[PDB]
């Protein structure tokens, strides 16, 4: 018995959930996945603690998918950031809201959150074959066969949940987008988006270090967010987010205190003109930073002159960087691009062109902000996806 109804190629997110939603549905189901291991890529996402959703509303959540977040609406009124905080609670795993309205399991660890998945699956009947990569899907009359070099299968309906093109060592490679051109949809351009930033700048004096909620200008775009200090440069979500205006020899800007303006930082001095300028400033910020920005100036902060405290406030506020560019789309946390919406169904994201095939998670066209927003994506259009609609 190599034939189900459903089909669907890929155990990321995507994948996982709509494997739940479809054998719910009644769907005799079958999940394949190339790797020996689920979620993969998703287990790394958080700092591979599982950024699993963000508790944000709906529109924190179109704010968090730029990259056309509006196709959404249909997906979201049916299964939303907050159906999967239930899903997990209602399942035994307690979560956690951090900053920005990051979410994630108490435990800290990735297991958690796909062990629960794998657990979920079982319980309704699902079945899954990893270690196997798919090489070749076909349509006949109303028949998809999926083969792998081994073996073949058969389906009705096809979900096809293979994800973007970035950190293909996860196993996304691009194999569904093989598939949208094979039926003879379009795969817009691939490109980076959330990718880090090269910087020419002397970065070991910083690396490691974070920074919550700073700001970072160029041009029109500008940014208010966290910042973390690497040592090729800048990455974390301010950095992130940015680099999707940028390409390599711009000078951008950082406010390290979007808090106060000159003035207050120039009363804070004058309260603290007793201590050290850098011990004055390590009440305000990380020690390292503190370092940083007053190793060229006097130990005290009286022994300042005026053209110091302003040339000083200056850099606090204005520290121009050096781009040399960012990482390639190997190396960025999205996928800008993919199979194109304007050939799938807002609501049950069906192929217009093949029926029973069915596209969700970073596969389509859709690119999202890191916090949750990736995932949540892929886990509501995955739960839409494998659920049934008759009409
Ligand atoms: C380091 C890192 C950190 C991230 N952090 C965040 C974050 O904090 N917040 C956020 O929202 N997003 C984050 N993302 C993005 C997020 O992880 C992805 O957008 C999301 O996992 C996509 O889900 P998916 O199921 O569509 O694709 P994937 O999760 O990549 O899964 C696709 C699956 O398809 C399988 N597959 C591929 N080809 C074949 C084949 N031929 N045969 C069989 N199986 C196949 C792959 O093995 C893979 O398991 C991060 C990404 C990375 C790399």
Same mark, same amino acid.
């Given at each position: ?13 995507? *994948? ?9 549905? *009644? ?15 998703? #287990? ?75 657990? &979920? ?16 899907? &076909? ?31 996860? *196993? ?7 598939? #949208? ?22 970065? &070991? ?43 390599? *020899? ?85 996928? &800008? ?40 994506? #892929? ?13």
């Amino acid at each position: 018995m190599n034939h189900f109804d459903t089909i669907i190629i890929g155990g990321g997110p995507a *994948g996982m959930m709509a494997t739940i939603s479809s054998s719910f549905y *009644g769907q005799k189901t079958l999940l394949l996945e190339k790797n020996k291991r689920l979620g993969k890529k998703l #287990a790394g996402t958080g700092g591979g603690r599982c950024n699993v959703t963000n508790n944000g509303n709906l529109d924190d959540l179109m704010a968090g998918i730029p990259g056309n977040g509006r196709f959404l609406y249909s997906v979201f009124s049916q299964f939303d950031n907050h159906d999967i905080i239930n899903f997990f609670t209602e399942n035994g795993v307690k979560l956690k809201v951090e900053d920005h309205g990051r979410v994630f399991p108490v435990t800290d660890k990735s297991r958690t959150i796909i062990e629960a998945l794998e657990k &979920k699956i079982a319980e309704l009947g699902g079945t899954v074959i990893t270690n196997t990569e798919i090489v070749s899907v &076909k349509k006949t009359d109303e028949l998809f066969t999926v083969r792998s070099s081994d073996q073949a299968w058969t389906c009705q309906k096809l979900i096809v949940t293979t994800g973007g093109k970035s950190y293909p060592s996860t *196993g996304s490679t691009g194999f569904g987008h093989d598939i #949208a051109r094979h039926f003879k949809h379009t795969v817009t351009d691939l490109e980076a988006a959330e990718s880090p930033l090269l910087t020419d700048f002397p970065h &070991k004096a910083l690396q490691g270090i974070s920074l919550d909620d700073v700001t970072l200008s160029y041009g029109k775009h500008i940014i208010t967010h966290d910042l973390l200090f690497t040592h090729f440069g800048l990455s974390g979500p301010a950095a992130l987010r940015l680099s999707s205006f940028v390409k390599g *020899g711009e000078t951008i800007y950082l406010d390290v205190l979007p808090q106060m303006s000159q003035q207050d930082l120039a009363d804070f001095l004058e309260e603290h003109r007793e201590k050290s300028l850098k011990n004055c400033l390590k009440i305000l910020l990380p020690e390292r930073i503190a370092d940083f920005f007053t190793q060229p100036f006097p130990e005290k902060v009286k022994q300042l002159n005026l053209s110091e405290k302003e040339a000083l406030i200056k850099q606090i506020k204005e520290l121009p960087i050096s781009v040399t560019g960012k990482m390639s789309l190997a190396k960025s946390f999205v996928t &800008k691009g993919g199979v194109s919406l304007k050939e799938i169904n807002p609501k049950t994201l069906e192929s217009k062109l093949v029926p029973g095939l069915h596209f969700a998670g970073e596969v389509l066209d859709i690119n999202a902000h890191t916090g949750g927003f990736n995932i949540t994506s #892929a886990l509501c259009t995955g739960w839409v996806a494998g659920s049934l609609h008759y009409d």
